[PDB]
C-alpha cells in the first residue's frame, strides 16, 4: 500500500513520488524566499479536524483562509514524519510516511494544493544527521552488518574514538557512543542514544538522503530547513563540527535541487554566531551555492537589551557587525533566541502591547526574512508545567469557548489542555475577541504585513542606519537601488517615555515622507535636521516620495 | 434604637446626629472640590464583606487601599438610604437609616472615618423632590390629612391642575397625578406613581429637608448631589421646571451649609444644556451662592463626534460656547452622556485602548473636575440582558477567579452574576491581571492621575485653545495666573492615523517643554511654528518651564 | 395585511383562520389528555433558528425530533401573543398576532403540522380576564366611550365599589381601581394597572373572546390553559371570585369547543385548593361540562414534607382528601406549588393540616414563594430527583415536565427562564449569534451550567438523568394504569415507605405496583398484597421477575430514597 514503508526481503522498499497525485505547482520564482513572511505552525497544535484531541493536516487545510487573511507567504511545519516520538518527532522512523496521527501523505498533497491555490508556499524540517532507533535501516544495520544497510551508520568496536568532539546533551548523554544490544558494537550519535547518526562517508547514504529530498519535492513542497547539518561528517582529531566534507555535500544537494526542482529553498539549522554561520551560504563568488538561508540568532536578544538599556546601539552594532551575504541568500530572522534548545513574545515583555508592537515593527523592517511563530499575532503565552519545548507547544487559542475552538472532542482526549493562565489563557487572549477590535494585536500585525507587501524595500532593499542626537531612537532607511525605487524610512523609539529626534536626512532633500499606515503627508525634507517626536515605544514607517 | 426611624404617636421621630459617634473630620478646605478627582461607586457592586452576594459598606472600607493607591480624591456613592427599591434606591423610605442590606449608620461612620484617614472625601446623592410611598410622612399624610404631615405632599381633588408641565416617564406614567386609595385624593409626582413629590410651599417640609442635610453632614459627609432639584416647586400656568422659588430655596440651603458645616460641596442634578444649567451656580456677583457644581453633559458626545469626524472643532466649540461660571464653582465632567436616563467607556469605543486612553487624557486635562465610574480604570463593559441602568450596575471585576473576587458567597446567592462576556467579562478584564502589566489600562490611569496631582493648572488653570494648521489635532494650554505659575501644554491627536502639527506657541517663546510622563526635555520654543508629531490617537502632556 | 390587527376606522378588524393555511388535525381522541405527558417550554428559551439571539417557533420545530425521542405527548407554550412584555407576555396586546420576536402565525401553523406528524400535540396559555393597556380595545374604550368598544371594560365614577374583593398583588397594587388619564374614570383591574379587566357582562366581549378561541383552534392548536378565569365576573356584595356567571360562561366555551372542534382540551388556571378547584370541572352529572383539567397544587409541597419528615402521611392525606372528579376530567400534576399568575404557594388554613408546618422546616421555607427547577430544589441529589420524578410519573393525573428538568438544569437569581442547554460549546448550542446579543446569557454555573450539564453529553452516556427520564417515560407509556388507573394505597408495617397500586378495571386489566422509600436510610416493608395472590411482580425497568405473591404479607427492601415499579402479571 502507498501509505507506509516496508522491508522485504533484505532491502528497505519505499514508495516513489509517482505513486501519489501531484499537487498544483506555483509559477517558478527563484527569489521568492527573499520577499516571504514565514509562519511556523505545529500541526498537532493548530486545528483538530478528525475530533481526536490532536491537530492534523486536514485541520490545517481548514485554517488556510485565516492564514491568507492574516497575510503570510509561506507555512513552515516542524517534522511530521512517522516516529515513535521519543524526541518530539525529530527521531524519524520513516521518511516516506506522515505520522498516522496527523494523517496520510494524500492529506499532505491536499494541503500543498490548497495552500498553493491561495498563493502560500510550504516548507518543512528534514532531519539529516540522524534517524530513530526505530528506523528500518538501523534495524537492518544491527541485524545484518554484512547486508546492504550494514554501513549506513557509524560503527566501532571501541568508545575511544572521535574524542575532543563535545557531548551536546550533557544533562542526559554521557558519551557519543552507545553500546547496541544486538550487534554488540558501539554507534555514533551527537544527539540522543535513540538517535543513531547516519554514516555520510557511505555513498549509498548520500544518495538515499538526496532521494528523500527528491521525494518530498516531487510531492510539491517548496523547500526544507535541513536539521543538524553541522554534525553530518566526523573526522578523527577534530571537534566534528562544520567540516569541509559537510559543506561539500550540501553544495551537491543544492546542485541537485536547482537542476531537478528549480525555485525551491534550503535553510540551514545551525545554532551559531553570524560569521561562523555565514559559511553555510557557500562561496560568495557563485552568488551562493549552498543554503539559501541561515538564521540570525543574536538579533532578538539585542533588540531586548536595547529596550532595557533604552539605547539603539545594541541593535545597530550587530547589524554593522553582520557579515555580508551572497546575492541568492537571505537571513532568516525571528523574535526568539533558542532553537534546540524557550519563552514566547508576549510573556517575555510582561504583556506590554506597545513593546510587542515595537518588536514586531522591527521584525518586519530590519534586513532579512521574518518568521512568525503561530499565535504570536494574538499574544499567546507559554506554560511552565511542561518545561521549555513542550511549554510553547500548546494548542492555538481561537475562541474563549470549550477547547478554545481548537477541537470538538471531549476535553480529556486532548493532547494538551489550552492554557487557563489568568493573563495569557484562551479566555483572556484569543482570535475571536481580537478579530473585530481594530487596534487588537491581531489586527495590528495584519496591517503591518499588508503594508510591508506593498514595499519591496523592506525585503530586499539596502540598509542605512542614520544617526540622531538621541541615543534612545533607532532610525534607518531601506532603499532599492535605481532611480524612482522603493524608499522607506523607519523611526523606532526604544525608550519607555516620549522622545524627540533630529535626523540628518540631507541624503533625501526635497523628498516628502508619507506615513504608510494612513498616507498622511509630512513636512518635506530640507537642508535642516528633520525633527520627529514619539511616545514611549512608538514607531513610524514612511515612504520617501519624489 | 439608634438604627431606624419610628412613628409615635402621630409624629415621625428621627435620631439626631449626636446619637452616633462622630467620625474624624478633614482640615477645612473651601475649594477642595476644584482639585478633586471623583470616583462614583455603587455599594452593592464593589465588594461583599458579609458574604451574602450583595456588596456592602464594610466591603468598601476594605477596598480603600485600592482607591488611595489608584489616587482618587473623593468617593461618590449613589443612594444607600432605606428603601423598598422599586426604583433602584431613589425611592427613599427613610432618610435616617442606611439600607439594612448595606449595613448600619455606624458602618457608614466607619467608612467616613477610614476614608478621611486616607485623605479621601465622601459625597452621596440625596433625593430632594420626592420620597417613596413607603415613607412614613406619606403614610401619615394619607391617613390623617388634618395631622402635622397632611400638608407635606401636594394634594388635589382634581387632575386638571399644573397642565403644560411635561410627563417625564412617558413610557410608564400617563399623568403627574395619582389617585391615592386611602385618602381618596390626587397627589403630585414628576417621576413614578410610587414617588410622591414633597410640597415645598410648606415651611415644615423645607426645614425637615434642611435637617436631613444637617444630619448627614453632622455624621461627617463632605457633600451631596441634590437630586431632581429642577422639579422642587410647581406653579400653575408654567412648565414647573427651574422656578425662581426653587433657586431661592437652594440659595438658603447653601447659606445654612456654609454657616453650620463650612467646606462641604453641593452638586446639582440637572440634565440640561449648559447656559440653562449655569443658573444653578447662583448669582455671579456673590462668587456663587447656590450649588458649587453642575455637570457638563454635551462634552463627552462632542469628544466622541470629534474622534469619528477626526476633527477638533466639535470639542473646541462647546468649550468656547460654555458660559462663564462664578469663582467658587466648577463643572463636573465625565465620560458619559446619560444620567436618569447608558453604556460604558470601553465597549462604546469597540475596546480600542488607545482611544480609551485618549478620552481619559482629555477627561483629566479639560476644564472642570473629572468623575470616573467604578471599573472604567480597567475597561469593564455593560450587559444588555439587564437593560440600561441595571446593565451598567454589574459587580466589580477584581480577579479572574470565582465571583471575580467580589464575593466568597455561593454563586447563586449573588445579586447579579459577573459578566462572562467573551471580551469585557471578568476572565478577560480584571484588576489582578492589570496591576502588574506596566502599560495596562489600570496602570495608565494611575499614572495620569499621579501626574495631574502635581499640576494644579489642570484643575484651576485658565484654558487657551491654540490653533494648528492640522484640524485633526487638538492642542491647548492650561495656565495658572501669576509669574512662575503652573503652565501645561496638551496635544491630542483625534485622527486614527499619525499626524504632524505646527503650533503657534509664540506666547511662550524661550520656554522649554518638559514631557510629564518621563521628564524628557523637548526643543525650546522659538519665534517659529513649533512642530510636533503623533501616532493615531496619541497625546502629549508638557510642562512649559522657564 | 394578514399579519397584525388594525383599527379601521372605528372598528378593530382582525384576520380569520381561513386567511392562513390549515394545519392537519390528528385522529379525534377525546380522552388523549388523560394519557398525555406534557412538556412545558418557553419559546424564547428553547432554540434560536433566526439567529437573532431569541428563541423562536422555527427553532422549536427543529427540536421536535428530540422531544419525540424523549417521549412527550404534548408541548405546552406560555403566552406568545403580541405584547409589550410589561408582565411576561401575560399582558396581551393582540390575540390575532404572534409576538414578532417569535415569528408569525404562519410559523405556528408549520409547528402544529410538524408536531402532529410526529404524534405530538400543542397547547398554550390564553389570558381571559384582562388584556394589556396597549390593546386596541382599551385604547378605543378610553377614547370613545360612545363607540362599540366603550363597554368592553369595567368603568366607574367611584373607587368605593366592589370593596369586598382582595388585592392579588398587595406589594405593587393598593386598589383594584385605577384612574385613567384620558377617559377620566376609574377602571377595574384584578392584576396590574396595565392589565385592565374585560367586562364579561357585555355580550359582545364574550362572543369576541370565544372567537379568539375559534381562531387558534381553527389554526390547529389542541388546547389552552384558560388563564385568570376565577376573576372573569364581578358582583357587588361578593368577593368577586368564582361567581356562578363565571362558571356559566366557561360552560358555553366548552359547549362551543366540543361542537365545533371535537377532541381538544381546556385547562383551568386557578391558584386554589383542590375542593375549590373541582368546581372548574363543571357538573359531574354531565361527565364534565367545563374545563377538562386543573392543577393539583398542594401535591409537591406535601411530597417535599414527606421526604423531610421521612413519613408517607403528608402524601397519603392529600390523596385521601382529593375530591373525586367527573368522568371526562384529569388533575394536572407538576413539581411546583403555585403558577405564574400569583406569588405565593397555594395553601388553606382550614383544610391543610401542614399549614403552619411548611415554615417550621428551613429547606421548605425557602421554597414557598421562589420557583426553582427540580435539581436545585433538591440540592442536586440524584436519588431524590429520581424519587420525585417517579412520584410525579406514577401518582394519579397527567404530569407536566418543565423544559430542562430532564437533564437537571438549575436557576439564576436577579430565574427559571434561562436558555436550553443543548451542548457544552458556544452559546450551549442554543444560538449561532453573538453571546452579547442573546436575550439572556446561558448559565455558566460550575455545577448547573452548560459545560457540566447538557443534552449532547447526557444523550450518549446510559447512566444520565436524561436517559433515566426517557426510560421512565417509555415504561409509563407501556402502562395505561399510570394515566387512567384507579389508586389504591396499601397497608404496610412501615410509614417510611409509600406503596400503592394502579389498576385498570376489567379482566386482564393493566396492574402496576409502586413502592417509594421516603427515608434517607434503607427500609424493609411488608405489604398487604393478598388481593393479588398468585400474581407475579415483574420489575419494569429490567423485566426481572420477583417472587410470586402469597397470602403472607409481601416483603420488599429499599435503600435510602429508592423506589421500584412492577407490573403485577398473571
Ligand atoms: Ca553524523
Ligand atoms: Ca415637587
Ligand atoms: Ca374580571
Of A40, A87, A269, A357, catalytic: A269
State the number of CA atoms in the 13 A half-sphere of B431 facing the CB. Answer: 19
**Chain C CA closest to residue B422:** C435
Report the residue of C423, C425, C432, C459 to disrupt the A interface, i.e. the one with the largest count of A CBs within 10 Å. Answer: C425
**Strand B121-127 vs strand B223-227: parallel, antiparallel, or unpaired?**
parallel
Task: Please give the CATH number for the structural domain made up of B461-546.
Answer: 2.60.40.1180
The verdict on whether A269 is a catalytic residue reads yes
How far is A76 from A468, CA to CA, in rounded Å? 38
Q: Would an 8 Å CB–CB cutoff place C412 in contact with chain B?
A: yes
Report the residue of B179, B186, B402, B416 to disrupt the C interface, i.e. the one with the largest count of C CBs within 10 Å. Answer: B179
Query: Shortest CB distance from C159 goes to which of B181, B384, B412?
Result: B181
CA distances, C260 to each of C29, C213, C249 (Å): 15, 11, 17
User: DSSP 3-state assignment of A542?
Assistant: strand
Q: Would an 8 Å CB–CB cutoff place C425 in contact with chain A?
A: yes
Nearest to C310 by CA among C471, C451, C497, C464: C497
Query: Any alpha helices (H) in C310-396, and if so which ranges?
Result: 313-320, 357-360, 362-365, 374-377, 382-394
What is chain C's alpha carbon radius of gyration, rounded to the nearest angstrom?
24
What is the least distance, in Å, from the CA of C424 to any CA of chain A? 7
- In C260-372, the DSSP E strands lie at 265-268, 293-295, 330-333
**Strand A74-77 vs strand B12-13: parallel, antiparallel, or unpaired?**
unpaired
Answer whether B223's CB lies under 8 Å from B26's CB: no
Question: Is C445 in Cβ contact with B420 (below 8 Å)?
Answer: no
Give CA angle at C102 (C100, C104), nearest 5°: 60
Of C87, C140, C269, C406, catalytic: C269
Answer whether A293's CB lies under 8 Å from A369's CB: yes
Buried b (16+ CB within 10 A) or exposed e, B141-157: bbeeeeeebbbbbbbee
CB burial class (10 A; 0-12, 13-18, 19+) of residue A546? Answer: exposed
CB atoms within 10 A of CB A273: 13
Torsion of CA A340, A344, A345, A346, to 10 degrees: -170
B7: enclosing H helix or E strand: strand B6-7
Partnered with residue B491 across adjacent β-strands are B475, B540
The dihedral built from the CA positions of residue B477, B480, B482 and B486, taken in this order, carries a sign that is negative
State the number of CA atoms in the 13 A half-sphere of A423 facing the CB. Answer: 20
How far is B155 from B153, CA to CA, in rounded Å? 6
Question: Is B438 in Cβ contact with A352 (below 8 Å)?
Answer: yes
Query: Shortest CB distance from B181 goes to which of C175, C184, C436?
Result: C175
Torsion of CA B56, B60, B61, B63, to 10 degrees: 140
Q: Cell match 529553498: residue?
A: A265
The size of the B-C interface in CB pairs under 8 A is 48
State the number of CA atoms in the 13 A half-sphere of C172 facing the CB. Answer: 14
Question: Is C184 in Cβ contact with B385 (below 8 Å)?
Answer: no
Question: Is C414 in Cβ contact with B413 (below 8 Å)?
Answer: no
CB atoms within 10 A of CB B28: 10
How far is A90 from C440, CA to CA, in rounded Å? 50
The dihedral built from the CA positions of residue B50, B54, B59 and B65, taken in this order, carries a sign that is positive
Neighbours of chain C (3+ CB pairs under 8 A): A, B
Domain C485-570 class in CATH: mainly beta
Q: C-alpha grid cell for residue C317?
A: 392525606
Structural domain boundaries of chain C?
1-129+200-484, 130-199, 485-570
Q: Which residues of A touch C451 (CB under 8 A)?
A: 402
Query: Ligand 1 mean position to B257 CA, how many Å?
Result: 91
Query: Any alpha helices (H) in C220-276, and if so which ranges?
Result: 244-260
Nearest to A458 by CA among A34, A74, A30: A34
**Chain B CA closest to residue C441:** B385
Task: Please give the CATH number for the structural domain made up of A1-129+200-460.
Answer: 3.20.20.80
Q: C-alpha grid cell for residue A48?
A: 483538530
B545: enclosing H helix or E strand: strand B539-545
Buried b (16+ CB within 10 A) or exposed e, C242-274: bbeebbebbeebbeebeeebebbbbbbbbbbbb
What is the least distance, in Å, from the CA of A306 to any CA of chain B? 18
How far is C443 from C187, CA to CA, in rounded Å? 42
Give CA angle at C472 (C466, C478), nearest 5°: 140
State the number of CA atoms in the 13 A half-sphere of C538 facing the CB. Answer: 11
User: DSSP 3-state assignment of B539?
Assistant: strand
Nearest to B57 by CA among B78, B72, B39, B73: B78
Partnered with residue A293 across adjacent β-strands are A267, A330
In angstroms, this model's resolution equals: 2.6
The verdict on whether B269 is a catalytic residue reads yes
How far is B91 from B227, CA to CA, in rounded Å? 11
Query: Do C1-129+200-484 and C485-570 agree at the fold level?
Result: no
Q: Would an 8 Å CB–CB cutoff place B497 in contact with chain A?
A: yes
How far is B219 from B222, CA to CA, in rounded Å? 10
Question: Is A500 in Cβ contact with B522 (below 8 Å)?
Answer: yes
Q: C-alpha grid cell for residue A138?
A: 538501523
Query: Ligand 2 mean position to A526 CA, how many Å?
Result: 70
DSSP class of residue A184?
-
| Angle, helices A244-260/A203-219, rounded to nearest 10 degrees | 40
Partnered with residue A462 across adjacent β-strands are A479
Question: Is B523 in Cβ contact with A531 (below 8 Å)?
Answer: yes
State the number of CA atoms in the 13 A half-sphere of C363 facing the CB. Answer: 11
- In A190-317, the DSSP E strands lie at 223-227, 265-268, 293-295
Question: Is B433 in Cβ contact with A422 (below 8 Å)?
Answer: yes
Question: Is B175 in Cβ contact with C159 (below 8 Å)?
Answer: no
Answer whether A394's CB lies under 8 Å from A344's CB: no
User: DSSP 3-state assignment of A132?
Assistant: coil
User: DSSP 3-state assignment of B361?
Assistant: helix
State the number of CA atoms in the 13 A half-sphere of B358 facing the CB. Answer: 28
Phi/psi region, residue C137 (left: phi>0; alpha: psi -120 to 50; beta: rest), is: alpha
**Strand B462-465 vs strand C554-558: parallel, antiparallel, or unpaired?**
unpaired
Backbone angles phi, psi at C42, to 5 degrees: -70, 125
Chain discontinuities in chain B, listed by preceding residue (C to N exceeding 2.5 Å): 341
Domain B130-199 class in CATH: alpha beta
What is the least distance, in Å, from the CA of A412 to any CA of chain C? 14
User: DSSP 3-state assignment of B544?
Assistant: strand
- In C63-154, the DSSP E strands lie at 74-77, 81-82, 94-98, 121-127
What is the least distance, in Å, from the CA of A394 to any CA of chain C? 20
What is the least distance, in Å, from the CA of A69 to any CA of chain C? 22
What is the least distance, in Å, from the CA of B494 to any CA of chain A? 13
Answer whether A265's CB lies under 8 Å from A223's CB: yes
CB burial class (10 A; 0-12, 13-18, 19+) of residue B228? Answer: buried
CB atoms within 10 A of CB B540: 22
Contacts of C570 (CB under 8 A, 6+ apart): C508, C534, C535, C536
CB burial class (10 A; 0-12, 13-18, 19+) of residue C170? Answer: exposed
Answer whether A534's CB lies under 8 Å from A499's CB: yes
Neighbours of chain B (3+ CB pairs under 8 A): A, C
Q: Which residues of C touch A402 (CB under 8 A)?
A: 424-426, 451
Backbone angles phi, psi at C221, to 5 degrees: -60, 145
**Chain A CA closest to residue B423:** A433
Buried b (16+ CB within 10 A) or exposed e, C151-162: bbbbbeeebeeb
Q: Cell match 412527550: residue?
A: C72
**Strand C293-295 vs strand C330-333: parallel, antiparallel, or unpaired?**
parallel
Share in percent of chain C as helix, strand, coil (round to 5): 30, 15, 55
The ligand minimizing its distance to the Cα of B152 is 2
Q: How far is C-alpha A160 from the chain's CA centre?
A: 37
Nearest to C214 by CA among C152, C250, C246, C256: C256
Q: Would an 8 Å CB–CB cutoff place B400 in contact with chain C?
A: no
Question: Is C445 in Cβ contact with B384 (below 8 Å)?
Answer: no
Q: Would an 8 Å CB–CB cutoff place B427 in contact with chain A?
A: yes
The ligand minimizing its distance to the Cα of A189 is 1
Long-range CB pairs of C431-435 (<8 Å, 24+ gap) are C431/C47, C431/C48, C431/C51, C431/C53, C432/C48, C432/C51, C433/C48, C433/C51, C433/C52, C433/C53, C434/C53, C435/B421, C435/B422
- In A393-484, the DSSP E strands lie at 462-465, 473-479
Question: Is B184 in Cβ contact with C159 (below 8 Å)?
Answer: yes
Question: Is B532 in Cβ contact with A518 (below 8 Å)?
Answer: no
The domain made up of C1-129+200-484 is a member of CATH 3.20.20.80 = yes
How far is B424 from C465, CA to CA, in rounded Å? 35
**Chain B CA closest to residue C447:** B411
CA distances, B149 to each of B11, B135, B146, B483, C539 (Å): 8, 11, 8, 60, 74
What is chain B's alpha carbon radius of gyration, rounded to the nearest angstrom?
24
CB atoms within 10 A of CB B4: 14
Amino acid at each position: 500500500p502507498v501509505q507506509g514503508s516496508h522491508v522485504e526481503g533484505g532491502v528497505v522498499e519505499h514508495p516513489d513520488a509517482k505513486d501519489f497525485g501531484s499537487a498544483a505547482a506555483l509559477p517558478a520564482d527563484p527569489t521568492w524566499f527573499k520577499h516571504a513572511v514565514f509562519y511556523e505552525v505545529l500541526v498537532r497544535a493548530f486545528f483538530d479536524a478528525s475530533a481526536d484531541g490532536s491537530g492534523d493536516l486536514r485541520g490545517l487545510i481548514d485554517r488556510l483562509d485565516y492564514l491568507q487573511w492574516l497575510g503570510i507567504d509561506c507555512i513552515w511545519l516542524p517534522p511530521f514524519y512517522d516516529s515513535p516520538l521519543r524526541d518530539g518527532g525529530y527521531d524519524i522512523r520513516d521518511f516516506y510516511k506522515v505520522l498516522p496521527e496527523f494523517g496520510t501523505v494524500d492529506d499532505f498533497v491536499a494541503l500543498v494544493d490548497a495552500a498553493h491555490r491561495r498563493g502560500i508556499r510550504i516548507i518543512t524540517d528534514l532531519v539529516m544527521n540522524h534517524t530513530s532507533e526505530s528506523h528500518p535501516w538501523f534495524q537492518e544495520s544491527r541485524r545484518d552488518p554484512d547486508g546492504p544497510y550494514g554501513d549506513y551508520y557509524v560503527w566501532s568496536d571501541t568508545s575511544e574514538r572521535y574524542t575532543d568532539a563535545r557531548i551536546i546533551f550533557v544533562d542526559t548523554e554521557e558519551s557519543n557512543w552507545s553500546f547496541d544490544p544486538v550487534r554488540r558494537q558501539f554507534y555514533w550519535h551527537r544527539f540522543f542514544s535513540h538517535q543513531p547518526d547516519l554514516n555520510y562517508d557511505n555513498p549509498a547514504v548520500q544518495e538515499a538522503m538526496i532521494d528523500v529530498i527528491r521525494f518530498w519535492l516531487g510531492l510539491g513542497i517548496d523547500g526544507f530547513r535541513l536539521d543538524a547539518v553541522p554534525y553530518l561528517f566526523e573526522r578523527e582529531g577534530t571537534n566534528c563540527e562544520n567540516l569541509p566534507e559537510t559543506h561539500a555535500f550540501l553544495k551537491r544537494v543544492r546542485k541537485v535541487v536547482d537542476d531537478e526542482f528549480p525555485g525551491r529553498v534550503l535553510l540551514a539549522e545551525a545554532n551559531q554566531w553570524p560569521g561562523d554561520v555565514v559559511e553555510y551560504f557557500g562561496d560568495p563568488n557563485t552568488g551562493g551555492d549552498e543554503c539559501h538561508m541561515a538564521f540570525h540568532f543574536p538579533l532578538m536578544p539585542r533588540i531586548f537589551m536595547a529596550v532595557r538599556r533604552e539605547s539603539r546601539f545594541p541593535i545597530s552594532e550587530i547589524i554593522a557587525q553582520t557579515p555580508p551575504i551572497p546575492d541568492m541568500a537571505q537571513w532568516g530572522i525571528f523574535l526568539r533566541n533558542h532553537d534546540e534548545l524557550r519563552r514566547r513574545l508576549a510573556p517575555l515583555l510582561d504583556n506590554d502591547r506597545n513593546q510587542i508592537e515595537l518588536f514586531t515593527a522591527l521584525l518586519l523592517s530590519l534586513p532579512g526574512s521574518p518568521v512568525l511563530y503561530y499565535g504570536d499575532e494574538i499574544g499567546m503565552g507559554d506554560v511552565i508545567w511542561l518545561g521549555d519545548r513542550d511549554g510553547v507547544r500548546i494548542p492555538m487559542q481561537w475562541t474563549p469557548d470549550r477547547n478554545a475552538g481548537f477541537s470538538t472532542a471531549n476535553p480529556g482526549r486532548l493532547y494538551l489542555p489550552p492554557s487557563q493562565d489568568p493573563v495569557y489563557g484562551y479566555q483572556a487572549v484569543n482570535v475571536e475577541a481580537q478579530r473585530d477590535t481594530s487596534t487588537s494585536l491581531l489586527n495590528f500585525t495584519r496591517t503591518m504585513l499588508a503594508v510591508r507587501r506593498r514595499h519591496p524595500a523592506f525585503a530586499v532593499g539596502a540598509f542605512q542606519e542614520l544617526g540622531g542626537s538621541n541615543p534612545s531612537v533607532l532610525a534607518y532607511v531601506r532603499q532599492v537601488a535605481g532611480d524612482d525605487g522603493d524608499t522607506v524610512l523607519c523611526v523606532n523609539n526604544l525608550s519607555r517615555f516620549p522622545q524627540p529626534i533630529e535626523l540628518d536626512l540631507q541624503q533625501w532633500t526635497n523628498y516628502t515622507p508619507v506615513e504608510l499606515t494612513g498616507h498622511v503627508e509630512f513636512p518635506r525634507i530640507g537642508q535642516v535636521p528633520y525633527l520627529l517626536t514619539l511616545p514611549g515605544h512608538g514607531f513610524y514607517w514612511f515612504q520617501l516620495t519624489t
